[PDB]
Amino acid sequence: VGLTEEQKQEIREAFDLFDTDGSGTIDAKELKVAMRALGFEPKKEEIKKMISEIDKDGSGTIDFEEFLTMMTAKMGERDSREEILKAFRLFDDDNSGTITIKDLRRVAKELGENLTEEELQEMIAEADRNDDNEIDEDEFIRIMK
């Protein structure tokens, strides 16, 4: 639940890696060279905005503590995701990848509840948002969170 020691040290080493001059702080130029090596190919305007969000003391640079606070909150997010998705997969009855009207018919049975096909499609359409009559991982995560 809280950062592991192993994660604390990984974040440090990732910090020291991004900090190429050893300044103690990640500047806007180091952030973009790090975001590319992370695959990314970001735009100046985004880098700036990253900087402004992670920075807390107006330096326009990221020190270790600002980086740690950010990484802490990302990993936190990533683990709440992985946990909502353990449940998703309970509701993905046939392990298809998305919760469909078939999955909910079956769930409904397995709870001894007699809900109509119409009663169930409403559900889908509330949580649905790309108009495919399915509930995918992001839709589920969303209607939980």
């Binding site: 946990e83 909502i84 353990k86 449940a87 309970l90 509840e113 809900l115 409403e122």
Partner: peptide, 20 residues
């Protein structure tokens, strides 16, 4: 486990008994 239990035990019957 706390997530999931709280969905089933409370969240699901509430939602069900609504559509009813």
């Amino acid at each position: 486990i706390g997530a999931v239990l709280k969905v089933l035990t409370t969240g699901l019957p509430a939602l069900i008994s609504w559509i009813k």
